[PDB]
Amino acid sequence: KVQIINKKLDLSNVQSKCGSKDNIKHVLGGGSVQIVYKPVDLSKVTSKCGSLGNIH
Amino acid sequence: KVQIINKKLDLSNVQSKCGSKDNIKHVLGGGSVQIVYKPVDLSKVTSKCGSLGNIH
Amino acid sequence: KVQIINKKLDLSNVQSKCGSKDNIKHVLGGGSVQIVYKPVDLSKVTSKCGSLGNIH
């Protein structure tokens, strides 16, 4: 048995000039909030040159 | 048995000049909020040159 | 047995000049909110040149 009372709460976003990259920004749960954040990442930024040559 | 009462809550977005990339921004759940965030990523940015040559 | 009462809630978007890329922006659930966010990504940005040559 649980009994919760959420009265007069404030979760308010006000922005003027803002660039963002935000995943889970504003979340409100009545009785519970579970968050599982497991991002995998296998990325590559490669550059391959064979026999480069620079001459003045 | 659960008993919840969500009265007078505020989740309000107000923006003026804002660029964003936001996945899960404003979420409100009556009794529970589960979030599973598991993005996979296998990306490539490659560049391959064989026998580059620069001469003045 | 569950008993929830969501009275006078506020989830309001007000924007003036805003560019965005937002996936799950404003979501309200009566009793529960489940979110499974599992985007896969196998992208390529490649460039291949064989025997480049620059001469002044």
Residue numbers in the entry:
A (entry chain B), B (entry chain A), C (entry chain C): 274 to 329
Give sentences copied directly from the paper behind this entry.
After helical reconstruction, we obtained a three dimentional (3D) density map with an overall resolution of 3.3 Å. The fibril comprises a single protofilament with a crossover distance of ~633 Å. The fibril core encompasses residues 274–329 (residue numbering based on the 2N4R Tau), which include the C-terminal lysine of R1, the entire R2 and 24 amino acids of the succeeding R3. This structure contains seven β-strands (β1–7), organized into a serpentine fold. Two elongated strip-like densities in the shape of peptide constituents, termed Islands A and B, are also evident. Island A aligns against R3, and connects with densities of R2 proximate to K290; Island B aligns against R3 as well on the other side, connecting with densities proximate to K321. In contrast, the structure of the human P301L mutant Tau fibrils extracted from the rTg4510 mouse markedly diverges from these Tau folds. Yet, when overlayed with the five ex vivo 4R Tau fibril structures, including GPT, GGT, AGD, CBD and PSP folds, a part of the P301L Tau (residues 297–311) that displays a U-shape, exhibits a similar structure to them. By comparing the P301L structure with the GPT structure, it is observed that the P301L mutation introduces a bulky hydrophobic side chain of Leu, which leads to steric hindrance against the interactions with H362 and P364 as seen in the GPT fold and preventing the attachment the C-terminal segment (residues 359–379) to the U-shaped motif. Instead, the P301L mutation establishes pronounced hydrophobic interactions with L282 and L284, which together with hydrogen bonding between the side chains of residues 286–299, attract the N-terminal segment (residues 274–299) to the U-shaped motif forming in the unique P301L fold.
